[PDB]
Amino acid sequence: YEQGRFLLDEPVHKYIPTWKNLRVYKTGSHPQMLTTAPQRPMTIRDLLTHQSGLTYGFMNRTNVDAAYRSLKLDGGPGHTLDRLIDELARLPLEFSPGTAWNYSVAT
Amino acid sequence: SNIIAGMDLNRLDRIAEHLDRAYLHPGKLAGTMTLVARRGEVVYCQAQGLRDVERQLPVERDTLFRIYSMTKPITSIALMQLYEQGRFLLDEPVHKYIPTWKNLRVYKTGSHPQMLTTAPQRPMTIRDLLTHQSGLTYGFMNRTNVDAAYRSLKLDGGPGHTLDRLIDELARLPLEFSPGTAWNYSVATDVCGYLVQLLSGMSLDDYFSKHIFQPLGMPDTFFTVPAEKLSRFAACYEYQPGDSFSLQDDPQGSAFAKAHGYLSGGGGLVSCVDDYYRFAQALANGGELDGARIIGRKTLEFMRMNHLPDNKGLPDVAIGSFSETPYDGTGFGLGFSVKLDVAKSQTVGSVGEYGWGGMASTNFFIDPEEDLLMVFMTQLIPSSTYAVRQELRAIINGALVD
Amino acid sequence: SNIIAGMDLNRLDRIAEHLDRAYLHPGKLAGTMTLVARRGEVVYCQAQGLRDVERQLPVERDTLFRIYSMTKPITSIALMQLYEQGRFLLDEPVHKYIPTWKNLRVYKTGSHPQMLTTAPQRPMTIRDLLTHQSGLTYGFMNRTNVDAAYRSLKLDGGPGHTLDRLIDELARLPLEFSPGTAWNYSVATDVCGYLVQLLSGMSLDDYFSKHIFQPLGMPDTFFTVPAEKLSRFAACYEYQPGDSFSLQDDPQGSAFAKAHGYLSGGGGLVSCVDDYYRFAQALANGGELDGARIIGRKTLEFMRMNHLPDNKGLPDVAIGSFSETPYDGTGFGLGFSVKLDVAKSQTVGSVGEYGWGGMASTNFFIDPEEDLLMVFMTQLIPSSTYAVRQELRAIINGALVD
Amino acid sequence: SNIIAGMDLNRLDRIAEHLDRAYLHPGKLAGTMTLVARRGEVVYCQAQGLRDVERQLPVERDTLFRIYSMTKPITSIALMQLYEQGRFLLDEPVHKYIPTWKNLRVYKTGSHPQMLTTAPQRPMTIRDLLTHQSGLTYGFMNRTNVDAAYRSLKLDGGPGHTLDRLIDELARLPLEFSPGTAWNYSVATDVCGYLVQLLSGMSLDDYFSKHIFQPLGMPDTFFTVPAEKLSRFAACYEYQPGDSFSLQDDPQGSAFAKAHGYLSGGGGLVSCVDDYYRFAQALANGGELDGARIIGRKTLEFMRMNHLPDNKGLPDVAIGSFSETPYDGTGFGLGFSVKLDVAKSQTVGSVGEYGWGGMASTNFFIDPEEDLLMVFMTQLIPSSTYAVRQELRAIINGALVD
Amino acid sequence: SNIIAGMDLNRLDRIAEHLDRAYLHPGKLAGTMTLVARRGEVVYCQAQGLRDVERQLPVERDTLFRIYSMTKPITSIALMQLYEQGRFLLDEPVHKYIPTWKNLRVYKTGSHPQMLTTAPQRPMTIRDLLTHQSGLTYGFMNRTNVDAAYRSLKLDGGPGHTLDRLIDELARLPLEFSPGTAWNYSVATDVCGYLVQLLSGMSLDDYFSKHIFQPLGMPDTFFTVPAEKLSRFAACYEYQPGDSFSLQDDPQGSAFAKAHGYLSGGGGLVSCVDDYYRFAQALANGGELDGARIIGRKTLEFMRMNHLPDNKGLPDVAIGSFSETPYDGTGFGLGFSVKLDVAKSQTVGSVGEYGWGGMASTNFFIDPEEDLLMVFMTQLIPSSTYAVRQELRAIINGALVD
Ligand SMILES: *[P@](=O)(CCCCCC)OCCCCCCCC
Ligand SMILES: *[P@](=O)(CCCCCC)OCCCCCCCC
Ligand SMILES: *[P@](=O)(CCCCCC)OCCCCCCCC
Ligand SMILES: *[P@](=O)(CCCCCC)OCCCCCCCC
């Protein structure tokens, strides 16, 4: 940030283009989850503050973290960051970015 | 100018024209059975297309259908028959009749079998079950860790499932919310079934047969399709992308043809248009048909009231897909939906219009302001797929000419 | 004709079946007298079980009962007879007629006799007394330091208690709240009794006899049971745990058999089913029976209105056990409860349904939408014990078949 | 049992018994004239006591009374006759017809003649005048620096006062509030009088005589009492402490006997019970009596509606003594009060009950639900003194027996 | 007293007296045609003044008028005829039938052609078009950068304008607001016209002629005035200061006389009083006239409901000049205004009163409570200029005498 490499209010999809069309969970089970448009795209500040709308496999509360567990996005054989980013591109968010807080893989 | 009971029959002919043009000819539905009645007189009855595509068999008037959740009004009436004998009160805790449910709690977090819970503000009441404000849910809802539990325990149906098992398993599960505080479509009506058994001493198929089907002359309504009648049983189809459908249940070798031990107050029944018409017409007459009475006129008027808090509609309290725009201006009584605001619903009809549907796109309604009713049979899962029940309403209300 | 006045008598027979199965055979109640009428015609009348368990005497139609708080509607009518002669106005301060009450104040804190108080926003009105918005209370409420004072002064009854004493003692006591701002069941109706005396010049037993009981042909209604009729007087029973009961009042050597000096506008009367039916049927007819009139049709229509602020129900304003779920969707007029929202009450019935009960489980109602009424007599203290009045409503409304 | 038009005449006799016992015998009122009618039939007519105490002259049926503000409904009808000829619209600014009023402003502070003011949100409308939402006031209100100005300019009456002068003086005075935003009893109706003149080309006494009094057969209603009828004119009395009264206006040498230049649309008229009955009965019949029509049935139904914002009662918007408890559940239309909530008013009566009174304790009402009406004449200033109009309502509604 | 259908014809004569005195003699309007009907019977019909001032030609009963926006109810009925054949549902996205509209967006800022936009909460529905909650607008609104775009693209009309062009151009323009969230008078009804074409396969003039004008016997209603009838065509006038008017459209060489390619569902039609009466009377009869039916009774009752959110009036949701005081207590259905609160509107009338007007001061209404209707024709742009439609209502409702 201090080298001017990004700004906190920039969309994440500027640096991760495959995340441009992330959507918010409405209902359904992996892999047939229905979704709604977010009010705005996810920002870097959202990631740094867990307001992304991402979640954690181990949360064990929602159909979304059930998806994280079946895809082993918390860890497990042949898991890389490249895989986490690739898999999250195809998953819904728990809420429109900024509108709530949920401890997440955001970090 | 053919007019019966203030209905232009030429206008009603648009039903068949519409189902052909929009659903049958383009292969979105296999076949339809459509009945309309007003002031006690049947003014429309029309089989169309096929009950079985694979065996090239047509829909006939006597064709048998999975009415699925159109069972719920029948189970509702059954239980309310016992209300009228003073066997219970609506504001009574369920745990009075099901003591193992005294300590039911509300889901906080976790996955089955380690779910954490919180105390409910108050115990679940019979009225909560009859109105889906229990805080119970359905396996197929696919929204929460709680319905994930329902699916892993096969509480919607599956081998060796009985009502006794549903009640035993639900005693150890959390609720989606403190009873009364919200609405969520549920097995609650299957439980009402269990309470009919509990209070009557009879198995649900026997209570139905004795106290509803025999009195009303409904010989073709049952949880299990007799072998002799299985030729009349329609195939069930499910939606496929491109507005097409695939085989979902073969009538030969159907679980509906076997007597497994599960009498589903919620979705179990097979019926035909004629039988459901007699049930509907009985309700339209205030509970009596051809000198047989299944419910008091007043008791029924009570069931058709909106029983949601502060005369709210389903979207004001529903957590589910009953939140969505089609259910705007519609409330819920003791086993029927109730139209509250016609303009808000964006569909022609009358305040008080009551009824329900089945997940296979079966639908019925009773417009008590117009003494008008419709029974619509098809077999396409899920009912959410097409807006056909709304198009039919448009056409039918269109055919009123007094 | 198994149907009288649009009521199936076969369905009404479930009343006796229910009271037997649920209360009498299991020994929860000693005996019941149950009357139902519609469109001026008595369609059900049934004595069951025993008026006196110890002496093995059955309930007969002519059996006399402690109607307790079912006195309140009679006292209400008595006072409103005088409203109709212009003898007072409802919005008048009580202290106009009871000058020693000019400086009544609201309880802040302390125990009798050193209670601190605050100024009320406005003086208590006659309408406040008739609607229990006085801010007066009852000894038996057992909630506040104020009712503790009522008990130590025996303001509910006891040796040497007169109305003159009640009025004199209340002058020196604080109110639970500024008059009009809340609802609390009270001696207010006993005070209405005192105001009937004050304005009429007659003792309350004489006003009742002259202006209500003689006109309506109620020869078996009185504050004191005449010696020659004491054989017909039922025993009173109180609840014991395990859904059982014990002797509470022996009809021989009962204070109701003596003329102590206390004419209780609130709970004093003994009556039979026939007498209370004539009073109820008079009200159902708009104040007239067989050419005798006890109240104007319009005056009565005024008493049956909800007199609570902003058409609120009892739980929106009640501080007491009338806060609880059974009184949801029920308001209060000048001596009657009034059903506001049927669905909210979770009990079948009609908007406008009015009546009241006695602490000994006596109950009556008049459904003005259905021209239907019930009188229920039993002697089990307290009325809160069982939901029998609700079960009877379920069955009775169940028997409507037009 | 004397019954005319569903009214017990024996019950109506309590009127005379009550006025004697409560007002006449104890010397609180000099004399009363009381008329009651229902379904077009006069069922009570009773003069009592004296029209002139000093000259020991009794009240007779033909006795003339200062009806004071009961003029306002007549002025209201006069103006609405012109609404029906399309001569104006209610939502039009007053300054369209009175251009010198374009720049009326709202009182901020100061004393006459140096009052500071603020801009109103919108100009005053005709509807504002007809409903006392003008922001005009009355000299006698004695609450604000504005009514102090009205008194120093004698805008309620006094030597050389004309309507032309009222309109000219009000052009230079501030309003109590932005028009529409509140209610305050006002000269607004005297201004309506001026607008009748403006639009009709006639003097108000001529418009009234031609278009109301002659058609209805009201020969004894006038702003000035003809010399030959001055024998029939009652004395006016004012309240004295100890519930007594003193001479206020001697009928000989009364300003009502002279034609000073002031035709008061607000309080000017003298009438008798018979004349005001014919006016009342015309309204009760939807604007027609004996083949004469003074107003369209629909136009009158419009005037009897509540014209206050959000169907509010007078106390929700009134700044005056019309804030107080007696006006609870009463609204205001185009020159009549309207009962909104019977229970809230604490007085027996019907929703829609409309009418008005005069400052000398004159009163009339029309219960359109019961086709019932009362005219009450007496001469005791002010009308606020006794609750007699409420006692009469109690007795009269008491006498309904269908 | 001539009375037809409970209407005094002598009172109705005030219409002509009023239009003469207030509009014609003072030269504010050129000429009027006024028809009033009640219970199926025409009780008033009166041509007055000139259809063409320049050519000194009088208004006759058969005179043709630019009804402008009184087209909108006809276009509304046309589309709802197709609702009744199940051809669409009101809650369907418009982009289902107009796929190029899938990605319509809401105006944020900028000038045509570089306007920035935001995503709408939901896609535009058919119900939005029929109720002007689309978020579309009109060129002539002259309030926003969006209507500036409509004017530069001549979307209200102009050389080579077709409906095909309107639809193509609107696909590339922003909406004033997210559909449903507000009300703004719009080309939405011209689009409904396009949807009639889309669904019927017919050009709009043909659909109208076949399915409305021929059935109802309206031979003198058309988008283009046939050469042989152009003698009957009135001149259109526009307002000039000093309450005067100037020539706006010469009937000889009028664009209404040419068949340019623009069929305006919003303002295109020319008609006469007799034709519009037949259309109005058909609606007043529940969709049938002399055995011809243009719409189902129930479908029409649906169109006359208030379709605004939470039964709000136009000012609660309108962004335009429909915000203003004249539209208080008026809602909006599927192509008609609906009176909600009579008192609030400050104009006499009934709850349910429905209709609409044209920008040339044409007006009609149907009071379904009184079975009463009016058609008023004149040619003065704009309709906002004079309150004549309100004065006519005052007089007409004034003439009711039952
Ligand atoms: P029901 O048919 C669910 C029956 C239990 C199925 C267990 C797998 O609910 C379907 C929802 C339809 C309601 C209204 C639909 C209109 C056609
Ligand atoms: P009342 O019987 C109290 C009489 C004074 C007794 C003083 C010790 O109030 C009882 C409450 C019952 C109301 C409705 C009950 C339904 C059966
Ligand atoms: P009006 O009589 C005032 C007339 C102008 C007097 C100028 C000094 O108002 C009196 C208020 C009475 C309204 C209702 C009273 C019930 C009897
Ligand atoms: P329409 O006549 C607009 C027609 C399209 C014109 C394109 C330049 O709307 C006029 C508004 C009148 C509504 C009610 C008026 C009462 C007489």
Residue numbers in the entry:
A (entry chain C): 90 to 196
B (entry chain E), C (entry chain F), D (entry chain H), E (entry chain G): 8 to 409
Quote the passages of the study that discuss this structure, keeping the authors' original sentences:
Family VIII esterases present similarities to class C β‐lactamases, which show nucleophilic serines located at the S‐X‐X‐K motif instead of the G‐X‐S‐X‐G or G‐D‐S‐(L) motif shown by other carboxylesterase families. Indeed, the analysis of the substrate specificity revealed its capacity to hydrolyse nitrocefin as a model chromogenic cephalosporin substrate (40.4 ± 11.4 units·g−1), and a large battery of 66 structurally different esters (up to 1730 min−1), including bis(2‐hydroxyethyl)‐terephthalate (241.7 ± 8.5 units·g−1) and the mycotoxin T‐2 (1220 ± 52 units·g−1). It also showed acyltransferase activity through the synthesis of benzyl 3‐oxobutanoate (40.4 ± 11.4 units·g−1) from benzyl alcohol and vinyl acetoacetate.
Structural analyses of free and substrate‐bound forms of this homooctamer esterase suggest that EH7 presents a more opened and exposed S1 site having no steric hindrance for the entrance of substrates to the active site, more flexible R1, R2 and R3 regions allowing for the binding of a wide spectrum of substrates into the active site, and small residues in the conserved motif Y‐X‐X containing the catalytic Tyr enabling the entrance of large substrates. These unique structural elements in combination with docking experiments allowed us to gain valuable insights into the substrate specificity of this esterase and possible others belonging to family VIII.
